[PDB]
CSV table of C-alpha atoms in Angstrom, one decimal:
chain,number,residue,atom,x,y,z
I,1,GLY,CA,0.0,0.0,0.0
I,2,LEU,CA,2.3,2.8,1.2
I,3,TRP,CA,5.0,3.5,3.8
I,4,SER,CA,3.6,7.0,4.7
I,5,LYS,CA,6.1,9.9,4.5
I,6,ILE,CA,5.1,12.8,6.9
I,7,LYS,CA,3.9,11.0,10.0
I,8,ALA,CA,6.8,11.3,12.6
I,9,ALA,CA,7.0,15.0,11.7
I,10,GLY,CA,3.4,16.0,12.0
I,11,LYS,CA,2.9,13.7,15.1
I,12,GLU,CA,5.8,15.8,16.5
I,13,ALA,CA,4.6,19.2,15.1
I,14,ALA,CA,1.3,19.7,17.0
I,15,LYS,CA,2.8,17.7,19.9
I,16,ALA,CA,4.8,20.7,21.1
I,17,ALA,CA,3.3,24.1,20.4
I,18,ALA,CA,0.1,23.4,22.3
I,19,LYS,CA,2.1,22.6,25.5
I,20,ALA,CA,4.9,25.1,25.0
I,21,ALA,CA,2.1,27.7,24.3
I,22,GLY,CA,0.2,27.2,27.6
I,23,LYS,CA,3.6,27.1,29.3
I,24,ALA,CA,4.4,30.8,29.0
I,25,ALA,CA,0.7,31.4,29.8
I,26,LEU,CA,0.8,30.1,33.4
I,27,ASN,CA,4.1,31.9,33.9
I,28,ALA,CA,2.4,35.1,32.7
I,29,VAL,CA,-0.6,35.3,35.0
I,30,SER,CA,1.4,33.6,37.8
I,31,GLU,CA,3.8,36.5,37.6
I,32,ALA,CA,1.1,39.2,37.8
I,33,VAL,CA,-0.4,37.7,41.0
């Protein structure tokens, strides 16, 4: 059938921004308190 081509990259793409994004978020408000 097919051995895929862009799977490890995409699976790693979204798996990073989402977390790294909310990261600076907590540090932001947690710094204003």
